[PDB]
Design a binder for these strands. Sequence first.
RNA 1: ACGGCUUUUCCGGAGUGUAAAAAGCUCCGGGAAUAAGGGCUGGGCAAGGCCGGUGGCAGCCGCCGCGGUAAUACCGGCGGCCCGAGUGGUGGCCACUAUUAUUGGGCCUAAAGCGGCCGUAGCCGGGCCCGUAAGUCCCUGGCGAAAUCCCACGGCUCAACCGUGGG
RNA 2: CCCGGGUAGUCCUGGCUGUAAAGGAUGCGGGCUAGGUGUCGGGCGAGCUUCGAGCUCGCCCGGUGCCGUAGGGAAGCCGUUAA
RNA 3: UGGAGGUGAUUUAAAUGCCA
Lengths: 146, 61, 175, 229, 129
Amino acid sequence: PGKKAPNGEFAGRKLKLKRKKFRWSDIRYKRRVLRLKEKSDPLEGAPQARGIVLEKIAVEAKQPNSGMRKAVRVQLIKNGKVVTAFCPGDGAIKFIDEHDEVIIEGIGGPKGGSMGDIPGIRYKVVKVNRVSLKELVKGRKEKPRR
Amino acid sequence: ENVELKFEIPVCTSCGREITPREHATHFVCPNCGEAIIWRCETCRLLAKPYKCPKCGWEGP
Amino acid sequence: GDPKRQRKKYETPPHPWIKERLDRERVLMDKYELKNKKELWKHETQLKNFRRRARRLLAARGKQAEIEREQLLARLKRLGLLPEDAVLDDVLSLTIEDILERRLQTIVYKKGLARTMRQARQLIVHGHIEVNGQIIRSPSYLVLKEEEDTITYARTSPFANPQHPERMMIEKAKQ
Amino acid sequence: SQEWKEYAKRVLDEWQPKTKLGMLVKEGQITDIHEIFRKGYQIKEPEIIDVLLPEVNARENQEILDIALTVRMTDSGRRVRFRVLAAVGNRDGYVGLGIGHGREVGIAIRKAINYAKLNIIEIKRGCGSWECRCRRPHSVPFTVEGKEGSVRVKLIPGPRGLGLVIGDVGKKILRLAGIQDVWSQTLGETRTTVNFAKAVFNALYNTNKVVVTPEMIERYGIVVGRAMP
Amino acid sequence: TLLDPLANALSHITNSERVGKREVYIKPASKLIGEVLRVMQKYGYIGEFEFIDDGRAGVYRVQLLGKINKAGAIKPRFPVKARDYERWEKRFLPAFEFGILIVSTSQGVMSHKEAREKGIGGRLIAYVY
RNA sequence: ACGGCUUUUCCGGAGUGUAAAAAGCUCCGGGAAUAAGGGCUGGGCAAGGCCGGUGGCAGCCGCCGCGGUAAUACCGGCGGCCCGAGUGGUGGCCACUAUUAUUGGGCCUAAAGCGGCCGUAGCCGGGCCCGUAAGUCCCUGGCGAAAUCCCACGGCUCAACCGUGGG
RNA sequence: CCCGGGUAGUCCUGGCUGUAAAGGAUGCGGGCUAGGUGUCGGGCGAGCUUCGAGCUCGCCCGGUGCCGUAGGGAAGCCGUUAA
RNA sequence: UGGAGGUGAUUUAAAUGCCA
Ligand SMILES: [Mg+2]
Ligand SMILES: [Mg+2]
Ligand SMILES: [Mg+2]
Ligand SMILES: [Mg+2]
Ligand SMILES: [Mg+2]
Ligand SMILES: [Mg+2]
Ligand SMILES: [Mg+2]
Ligand SMILES: [Mg+2]
Ligand SMILES: [Mg+2]
Ligand SMILES: [Mg+2]
Ligand SMILES: [Zn+2]
């Protein structure tokens, strides 16, 4: 290597070219201009959504742990997509019956992906039948629509 | 504090760049003279560069 | 492009947990009996802006920058935070504590208008003190220089007669 | 500052040297700190400084950065020893820095506190940022730099009052020498507290590696060591 | 190739001091280099120099004082409106005035410690400090 | 625990405000009466070596990480610290990130030199004298709306908010 | 993997293929900044010399090697043939 | 003192390993 590429007075045009090109080899630049987070995002890039449930299943954790966390499958309304919702709160699974409208948020981990031991999920519960779940975690409120 | 130029940075006689608080400079009364004082700064001393008594005419180590 | 917003008037702290910083502001948070932490930072900000003005006018030069600098001393001594003549550089030798004094709460206290700090506050916020012939209800006013001395009780207040026996508690301490 | 003269009569009588500099301080010729350094002596016995800088032992000119344990293996299990990074110096103009080792946290701390008594060196100061045109030693005079390990750093003057602004294991060792307001530009990796310490302290050494001609002395108020007790 | 009668010279001299030398030799000798010597000497930085020519572009003989910490050169060769100086004294210097910053204006070459008084601007060249 | 005192707030009531009103605002008459959540409580990071349940089970976890019958790291309770009419949760953007670098990065072993060689264009180019005034620099006319920023001063009780000046 | 045999290829003439650890794992030009030590070319200077276009010893300019200061790098390490 | 390069040699049958 030597001093630097267009390190002259007039050649600024070449310099803007150099920067305009080598800027692309990034990764946050691309994933924005071409709007790739869009049109691959089961919510179309928004902070919440509503859905209906289909089943009640259970998943296993990462390699050095132990347990079976509970899981539900929501069928969306905005798109007809079918996405995977985990629910916190010990034994909350005592309530979500087949065909209850629920809400869905993120889980806010690395990159927005998953987190912690459950690696395969990306979505968690907040409200059921218009009721904030944290309540039913400690009871403290009763439940409408059965 | 009662600064009367209290204590003065001695300066090399070969190099000319005054002397830092740990450089292994060294002092000795000028030979052949017995009167003048001579220091030699560190790098000034490694690659042996000559000197000369300010009052004698005898020069170089 | 986009309509103008109304800025907040202060600066929260970068990190709120620097242990020895909490346990530095701690004492002043009581030594004057303020209420919420913000009730202080406002004034720190007021200080940092004075200083951010002090430097910049010192590293420029020009017809207006000079007057804009020399129209300052008039203020920052007219308020009273300064000596009579402190040439520009002294403006950097100011503290949180000088500004902290000129609050009406302290001044009405360092003039013996009541027993303690947590009570001069109420004596104001119920409306008994008065500035240059004017009520105020602001435990955070900055009394100027021209008015520290023209201050008494209210011409309609239950205290303004040396017979409100609570007023007659107030002298006993003075000595 | 009484006790830190009582220590002189406590110490000067209770010790006989084993080196030479010991004598030339013990018998009354050299009795002022700032005239032992700029001549290339050797410091091997850690009392000569105490006898002239008797506030180095005050538990406030002393600061303890970190304890960190290190391990090695042998065919009989693990063998483990500690390293603490300790620096000292009076809050006027003089600072020293040492590492030390040992098998227990005490012996380690004491050993290091002693090692960091010898290397101790002195500074210059000033005020020459573009704002503090004052002449009072509240900042490092002129922007200089020092290198170590895989970390460079270059210090910049700044106005009287802007609080210390450098990483959290730099604020101490800057506070000791009392350098109050100074701005920081970092490179490399600031997560080996050691090379951080050594690079900062090296810069403060280098402070006396630039020639300032006669006139400029009365431009930033350069001092040496103590100034106006 | 011989792209620069100057950066050659300044880098060569700021090495010649770094080993501790005493005499030097500038190899190609413009008139502007003799100019820059003039301005660089008047403030007490180098010894007594003279122009020896031997038939081609001459040489230069100068002696030193081992006395200048670092000198370089500014190649992109900016011009400066006469009022943006700090912006270029926060880039090359150890202080607000420690040292100089040469200038090539419309009345010749002259340090900015006088260019700011007469209030002019223009292309820089290099920096001694 | 007792003794004094208060009336911003809260209930009644009048004046005044108003296009009509409502608020506010000066007076009276009442009375400590009418006024507290939220998050945390293993290191990052202020904070419990405190008590009571749970058995690689339920669960926590922004990362590293706990749970094997003796858990400061779950569930509680009891204590405890940070903000304070707000404190929390998921999404975008900038700083931190010299991980997009003219200031100001690198490319022998870690990403990274084209298998080597001619030359097109474009980018950088020796010394000396005489002119040109485009590039440059300075002084100077005409110009780049008001709003928005900053400086004091003045009016609403001071603060916002409005105005005369000055950039 | 060891052994006994054996087709295409290797070989000659006119072609297309354009692939390597194609490795100094180091693009290419210019100026400068210690000293030591061999060796190929040329040349200059002294000596010898079976007088041969030979054999020693200095010094100047070019390629190819090793040891190591100032400085530089995370360190292996480079050091006028720079990293 | 330590290497820094080159030519030769350099050997029957020998597979795999829960749990904290
Ligand atoms: Mg608990
Ligand atoms: Mg803590
Ligand atoms: Mg990098
Ligand atoms: Mg030319
Ligand atoms: Mg406008
Ligand atoms: Mg007013
Ligand atoms: Mg006002
Ligand atoms: Mg305003
Ligand atoms: Mg306005
Ligand atoms: Mg075998
Ligand atoms: Zn100063």
